[PDB]
């Protein structure tokens, strides 16, 4: 039989910035 | 039989920023 | 038999920021 | 003077699926 | 004076799928 | 004066799938 499929498309988005130890004197 | 499907599309979005130990003297 | 389906689409959104120990003297 | 800033991070998430006119006879 | 900045990071996520006119006889 | 900057990082994600006119007889 006929069939139309669309699997997947799971779009994952990540963001992990970082600033190092700030010795601001 | 005929069938039209759309599975998945689960879009997950994350954000984990970080600022290090701030010794601001 | 005919069938039209739309499964998934569960969009999850997260945010976990962080500021480090602030020694602001 | 010292300053630690984190501007933006406004994460917007959208989803606009569509199934066309279904003449399922 | 000292300053630590993190601007932007606005992550936008979109999804606009489409299935055409389905004449499923 | 000293300055630590992180500009941009605006990550945009898009998805525009398409299925053509389905004459499924």
Measured CA distances, B15 to A9, A12, D10, D16 (Å): 20, 11, 10, 23
The three-class DSSP label of residue E8 is coil
- Tell me which method was used to determine the 3D structure: cryo-EM
How far is it, in rounded angstroms, from Cα D7 to Cα E7?
5
Residue found under tokens 């010292």 = D2
- DSSP summary character for residue A18: -
Eight-state DSSP code of residue C20:
-
F17 vs A4: CB contact, 8 Å cut-off? no
Neighbours of chain B (3+ CB pairs under 8 A): A, C, D, E, F
Distance separating alpha carbons of residues F8 and C9, to the nearest angstrom: 29
CB-CB contact of D17 with F19 (8 Å)? no
DSSP β-bridge partners for residue E22: D22, F22
In this structure, what DSSP letter does residue F12 have?
E
**CB of A7 within 8 Å of any CB in chain F?**
no
Q: Indicate yes or no: CB of B1 within 8 angstroms of CB of A1.
A: yes
- List, in sequence order, every beta strand (DSSP E) within E1-25: 12-13
Tokens of C3: 């069938």
| Experimental structure resolution, Å | 3.4
F23 and E22 Cβ atoms separated by less than 8 Å: no
Tokens, residue C10? 């569960």
Residue D23, classed as helix, strand or coil, is coil
Distance CA F18, CA F21 (A): 10
- Cα separation, D15 vs D11, in Å, equals 14
Distance in angstroms (rounded) separating the CA atoms of residues B20 and F18? 45
Asked if B19 and E4 count as a contact pair (C-beta separation under 8 A), the reply is yes
């Amino acid at each position: 039989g006929q069939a139309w499929n669309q699997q997947g498309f799971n779009q994952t988005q990540s963001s992990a910035p970082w600033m190092g130890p700030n010795y601001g004197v």
